[PDB]
Amino acid sequence: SGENLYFQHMVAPAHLEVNVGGYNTEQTIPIVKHQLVKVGRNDKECQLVLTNPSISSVHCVFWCVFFDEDSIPMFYVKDCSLNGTYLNGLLLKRDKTYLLKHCDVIELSQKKTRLVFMIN
């Protein structure tokens, strides 16, 4: 399991840049194949943990699927929260899968933490 996830880094196809108060912290969370990246309050479940009281246990999730003989990457986000997740300032519909584009900004309803999605 560990070796397999290691080798998916062998550049990650995308990553989240963690942004606090408008500025990058320098932390990145890679988005690699065959992993679900969860953001929320629950450390057992989440790869990135936010403690703001409005944040859900699992607030939003990120993953990718490579289609057509591993040639066309699609990157997804899904809101799982009570109070909402914003994509470029726009409220996602809860439990609906949304396709991400390079430089999209994800804000969890909560200065504030934003996640900047970057394709590599």
Side-chain angles (χ1 to χ4, degrees):
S1 43
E3 301 176 348
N4 299 82
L5 169 59
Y6 170 83
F7 288 127
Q8 290 308 325
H9 295 75
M10 178 195 314
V11 193
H15 66 268
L16 299 169
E17 303 186 349
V18 181
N19 183 279
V20 175
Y23 321 97
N24 292 344
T25 66
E26 302 294 354
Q27 184 186 177
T28 69
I29 313 282
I31 293 171
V32 303
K33 282 187 268 177
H34 320 128
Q35 288 300 323
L36 193 57
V37 171
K38 295 179 177 182
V39 181
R41 205 179 70 241
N42 180 342
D43 186 23
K44 173 56 164 179
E45 300 260 282
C46 294
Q47 282 57 69
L48 178 65
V49 171
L50 311 193
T51 58
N52 181 284
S54 179
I55 298 294
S56 284
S57 178
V58 177
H59 197 108
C60 63
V61 302
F62 296 85
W63 71 102
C64 65
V65 182
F66 281 53
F67 289 87
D68 190 15
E69 310 199 292
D70 209 32
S71 75
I72 308 170
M74 301 277 118
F75 302 91
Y76 303 103
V77 65
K78 184 170 83 177
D79 172 53
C80 301
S81 71
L82 294 188
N83 288 319
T85 301
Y86 299 89
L87 175 55
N88 305 326
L90 307 182
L91 182 64
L92 300 177
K93 178 176 185 72
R94 192 176 168 181
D95 301 319
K96 179 172 163 58
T97 296
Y98 288 96
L99 206 41
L100 294 162
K101 299 182 186 191
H102 183 60
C103 293
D104 278 351
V105 177
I106 299 91
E107 182 172 341
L108 281 63
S109 186
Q110 290 157 69
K111 203 190 49 183
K112 290 167 295 185
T113 300
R114 301 172 173 80
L115 309 171
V116 184
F117 169 81
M118 306 289 279
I119 297 183
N120 305 315

Coordinates of all heavy atoms in Angstrom, one line a residue, residues 34-76:
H34 N -5.8 6.8 -7.6 CA -6.2 5.8 -6.7 C -6.2 6.2 -5.2 O -6.2 5.4 -4.3 CB -5.3 4.5 -6.9 CG -5.0 4.3 -8.3 ND1 -3.7 4.1 -8.8 CD2 -5.8 4.2 -9.4 CE1 -3.7 3.9 -10.1 NE2 -5.0 4.0 -10.5
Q35 N -6.1 7.5 -5.0 CA -6.3 8.1 -3.6 C -7.4 9.1 -3.6 O -7.6 9.9 -4.5 CB -5.0 8.7 -3.1 CG -3.9 7.8 -2.7 CD -4.3 6.8 -1.6 OE1 -5.0 7.1 -0.7 NE2 -3.8 5.6 -1.8
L36 N -8.2 9.0 -2.5 CA -9.2 10.0 -2.2 C -8.6 11.0 -1.2 O -8.2 10.5 -0.1 CB -10.5 9.3 -1.7 CG -11.8 10.1 -1.6 CD1 -12.1 10.7 -2.9 CD2 -12.8 9.1 -1.2
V37 N -8.5 12.3 -1.5 CA -8.0 13.3 -0.6 C -9.2 13.9 0.1 O -10.0 14.6 -0.5 CB -7.1 14.3 -1.3 CG1 -6.8 15.5 -0.4 CG2 -5.9 13.7 -1.9
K38 N -9.3 13.7 1.4 CA -10.4 14.3 2.2 C -9.9 15.5 3.0 O -8.9 15.4 3.6 CB -11.0 13.2 3.1 CG -11.7 12.1 2.2 CD -12.3 11.0 3.1 CE -13.0 10.0 2.2 NZ -13.6 8.9 3.0
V39 N -10.8 16.5 3.0 CA -10.5 17.7 3.8 C -11.6 17.9 4.8 O -12.8 17.8 4.4 CB -10.3 18.9 2.9 CG1 -10.0 20.2 3.7 CG2 -9.2 18.7 1.9
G40 N -11.3 18.2 6.1 CA -12.4 18.3 7.0 C -11.8 18.3 8.4 O -10.6 18.6 8.6
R41 N -12.7 18.1 9.4 CA -12.3 18.2 10.8 C -11.8 16.9 11.4 O -11.1 16.9 12.5 CB -13.5 18.7 11.6 CG -13.3 19.3 12.9 CD -14.7 19.8 13.5 NE -15.5 18.6 14.0 CZ -16.7 18.3 13.5 NH1 -17.3 19.0 12.6 NH2 -17.3 17.2 14.0
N42 N -12.1 15.7 10.8 CA -11.9 14.4 11.4 C -10.6 13.9 10.9 O -10.4 13.5 9.8 CB -13.0 13.5 10.9 CG -12.9 12.1 11.4 OD1 -11.8 11.7 11.9 ND2 -13.9 11.3 11.4
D43 N -9.6 13.9 11.9 CA -8.2 13.5 11.5 C -8.2 12.0 11.0 O -7.4 11.7 10.1 CB -7.3 13.7 12.7 CG -5.8 13.4 12.3 OD1 -5.5 13.5 11.1 OD2 -5.0 13.2 13.1
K44 N -9.0 11.1 11.6 CA -8.9 9.8 11.2 C -9.2 9.7 9.7 O -8.6 8.8 9.0 CB -10.0 8.9 11.9 CG -10.2 7.5 11.4 CD -8.9 6.7 11.4 CE -9.1 5.2 11.3 NZ -7.8 4.5 11.2
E45 N -10.1 10.5 9.1 CA -10.5 10.4 7.8 C -9.8 11.3 6.8 O -9.7 11.0 5.6 CB -12.0 10.7 7.6 CG -12.9 9.8 8.4 CD -13.5 8.7 7.5 OE1 -14.5 9.0 6.8 OE2 -13.0 7.6 7.6
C46 N -9.3 12.4 7.3 CA -8.9 13.6 6.4 C -7.4 13.7 6.3 O -6.7 13.5 7.3 CB -9.5 14.9 6.9 SG -11.3 14.9 6.9
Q47 N -7.0 14.0 5.1 CA -5.6 14.3 4.8 C -5.2 15.7 5.2 O -4.0 15.9 5.5 CB -5.3 14.0 3.3 CG -5.2 12.6 2.9 CD -6.5 11.8 3.3 OE1 -7.5 12.0 2.7 NE2 -6.3 10.9 4.3
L48 N -6.1 16.6 5.1 CA -5.9 18.0 5.6 C -7.0 18.3 6.6 O -8.2 18.1 6.3 CB -6.0 18.9 4.4 CG -5.8 20.4 4.8 CD1 -4.5 20.6 5.4 CD2 -6.1 21.3 3.6
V49 N -6.6 18.7 7.8 CA -7.5 18.9 8.9 C -7.7 20.4 9.2 O -6.7 21.1 9.4 CB -7.1 18.2 10.1 CG1 -7.9 18.5 11.4 CG2 -7.1 16.7 9.9
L50 N -8.9 20.9 9.2 CA -9.3 22.2 9.5 C -10.1 22.2 10.8 O -11.0 21.3 10.9 CB -10.0 22.9 8.4 CG -9.4 22.9 7.0 CD1 -10.1 23.9 6.1 CD2 -7.9 23.1 7.0
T51 N -9.9 23.1 11.7 CA -10.5 23.1 13.0 C -11.6 24.1 13.2 O -12.3 24.1 14.2 CB -9.5 23.2 14.1 OG1 -8.8 24.5 14.0 CG2 -8.5 22.1 14.1
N52 N -11.8 25.1 12.3 CA -12.9 26.0 12.3 C -14.2 25.3 12.7 O -14.5 24.2 12.2 CB -13.1 26.7 11.0 CG -14.2 27.7 11.0 OD1 -15.4 27.4 10.9 ND2 -13.9 29.0 11.0
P53 N -15.0 25.9 13.6 CA -16.2 25.1 14.1 C -17.2 24.8 13.0 O -18.0 23.9 13.2 CB -16.8 26.1 15.2 CG -16.2 27.4 14.9 CD -14.8 27.1 14.3
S54 N -17.2 25.6 11.9 CA -18.2 25.3 10.9 C -17.8 24.2 9.9 O -18.6 23.9 9.0 CB -18.4 26.6 10.0 OG -19.3 26.4 9.0
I55 N -16.6 23.6 10.1 CA -16.1 22.6 9.2 C -16.6 21.2 9.5 O -16.6 20.8 10.7 CB -14.6 22.6 9.2 CG1 -14.0 24.0 8.7 CG2 -14.0 21.5 8.3 CD1 -14.4 24.3 7.3
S56 N -17.1 20.5 8.5 CA -17.6 19.2 8.7 C -16.5 18.1 8.9 O -15.4 18.3 8.5 CB -18.5 18.8 7.5 OG -19.7 19.5 7.5
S57 N -16.9 17.0 9.5 CA -16.0 15.9 9.8 C -15.3 15.5 8.5 O -14.0 15.4 8.5 CB -16.8 14.7 10.3 OG -16.0 13.6 10.5
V58 N -16.0 15.3 7.4 CA -15.4 15.2 6.1 C -16.2 16.2 5.3 O -17.4 16.1 5.1 CB -15.6 13.8 5.4 CG1 -15.1 13.8 4.0 CG2 -14.8 12.8 6.3
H59 N -15.5 17.3 4.9 CA -16.1 18.5 4.3 C -16.1 18.5 2.8 O -17.2 18.7 2.2 CB -15.4 19.7 4.9 CG -16.2 21.0 4.7 ND1 -16.8 21.7 5.8 CD2 -16.5 21.7 3.6 CE1 -17.4 22.7 5.3 NE2 -17.2 22.8 4.0
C60 N -15.0 18.2 2.2 CA -15.0 18.0 0.7 C -13.9 17.0 0.4 O -13.0 16.7 1.2 CB -14.8 19.3 0.0 SG -13.3 20.1 0.3
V61 N -14.0 16.4 -0.8 CA -13.1 15.3 -1.2 C -12.7 15.6 -2.6 O -13.4 16.2 -3.4 CB -13.8 13.9 -1.1 CG1 -14.2 13.6 0.3 CG2 -14.9 13.8 -2.1
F62 N -11.4 15.1 -2.9 CA -10.8 15.4 -4.2 C -10.3 14.0 -4.7 O -9.8 13.2 -3.9 CB -9.6 16.3 -4.1 CG -9.9 17.7 -3.6 CD1 -10.0 18.0 -2.3 CD2 -10.1 18.7 -4.6 CE1 -10.3 19.3 -1.9 CE2 -10.3 20.0 -4.2 CZ -10.4 20.3 -2.9
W63 N -10.3 13.8 -6.0 CA -9.7 12.6 -6.6 C -9.5 12.8 -8.1 O -10.0 13.8 -8.6 CB -10.5 11.4 -6.3 CG -11.9 11.3 -7.0 CD1 -12.1 10.5 -8.1 CD2 -13.1 11.9 -6.7 NE1 -13.4 10.6 -8.5 CE2 -14.0 11.5 -7.7 CE3 -13.5 12.8 -5.7 CZ2 -15.4 11.9 -7.7 CZ3 -14.8 13.2 -5.7 CH2 -15.7 12.8 -6.7
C64 N -8.9 11.9 -8.7 CA -8.8 11.9 -10.2 C -9.0 10.6 -10.8 O -8.9 9.5 -10.1 CB -7.4 12.5 -10.6 SG -6.0 11.5 -10.2
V65 N -9.4 10.6 -12.1 CA -9.6 9.4 -12.9 C -9.0 9.6 -14.2 O -9.2 10.7 -14.8 CB -11.1 9.1 -13.1 CG1 -11.3 7.8 -13.9 CG2 -11.9 9.0 -11.7
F66 N -8.1 8.7 -14.6 CA -7.4 8.8 -15.9 C -8.2 7.9 -16.8 O -8.3 6.7 -16.6 CB -6.0 8.3 -15.8 CG -5.0 9.4 -15.3 CD1 -5.3 10.0 -14.1 CD2 -3.9 9.7 -16.0 CE1 -4.4 11.0 -13.6 CE2 -3.0 10.7 -15.5 CZ -3.3 11.3 -14.3
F67 N -8.8 8.5 -17.9 CA -9.6 7.8 -18.9 C -8.8 7.4 -20.1 O -7.7 8.1 -20.4 CB -10.8 8.7 -19.3 CG -11.8 8.9 -18.2 CD1 -11.7 9.9 -17.3 CD2 -12.9 8.0 -18.2 CE1 -12.7 10.0 -16.3 CE2 -13.9 8.1 -17.2 CZ -13.8 9.2 -16.3
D68 N -9.2 6.4 -20.8 CA -8.8 6.1 -22.1 C -7.3 5.7 -22.2 O -6.5 6.4 -22.7 CB -9.1 7.2 -23.1 CG -8.9 6.8 -24.6 OD1 -8.8 5.6 -24.9 OD2 -8.9 7.7 -25.4
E69 N -7.0 4.5 -21.7 CA -5.7 4.0 -21.6 C -4.7 5.0 -20.9 O -3.6 5.3 -21.4 CB -5.2 3.6 -23.0 CG -6.2 2.7 -23.8 CD -5.5 2.0 -24.9 OE1 -5.1 2.7 -25.9 OE2 -5.4 0.8 -24.8
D70 N -5.2 5.5 -19.8 CA -4.4 6.3 -18.8 C -3.9 7.6 -19.5 O -2.9 8.1 -19.1 CB -3.2 5.4 -18.4 CG -2.7 5.8 -17.0 OD1 -3.6 6.2 -16.2 OD2 -1.5 5.7 -16.7
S71 N -4.7 8.1 -20.4 CA -4.3 9.2 -21.2 C -5.0 10.5 -21.0 O -4.4 11.6 -21.3 CB -4.4 8.9 -22.7 OG -5.7 8.9 -23.2
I72 N -6.2 10.5 -20.5 CA -7.0 11.7 -20.2 C -7.3 11.9 -18.8 O -8.3 11.3 -18.3 CB -8.3 11.8 -21.1 CG1 -8.0 11.5 -22.6 CG2 -8.9 13.1 -20.9 CD1 -9.2 11.3 -23.4
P73 N -6.6 12.7 -18.0 CA -6.9 12.9 -16.6 C -8.1 13.8 -16.4 O -8.2 14.9 -17.0 CB -5.6 13.5 -16.0 CG -5.0 14.2 -17.2 CD -5.3 13.4 -18.4
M74 N -9.0 13.4 -15.5 CA -10.0 14.3 -15.0 C -9.9 14.4 -13.5 O -9.6 13.4 -12.9 CB -11.4 13.7 -15.4 CG -11.7 13.5 -16.9 SD -12.2 15.1 -17.5 CE -10.9 15.4 -18.7
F75 N -10.1 15.6 -13.0 CA -9.9 15.8 -11.6 C -11.2 16.3 -11.0 O -11.8 17.2 -11.6 CB -8.8 16.9 -11.4 CG -7.5 16.5 -12.0 CD1 -7.2 16.9 -13.3 CD2 -6.6 15.8 -11.2 CE1 -5.9 16.5 -13.8 CE2 -5.3 15.4 -11.8 CZ -5.0 15.8 -13.0
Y76 N -11.6 15.8 -9.9 CA -12.9 16.0 -9.3 C -12.9 16.5 -7.9 O -11.9 16.2 -7.1 CB -13.7 14.7 -9.3 CG -13.9 14.1 -10.7 CD1 -13.1 13.0 -11.0 CD2 -14.8 14.6 -11.6 CE1 -13.2 12.4 -12.3 CE2 -14.9 14.0 -12.8 CZ -14.2 12.9 -13.1 OH -14.3 12.3 -14.4

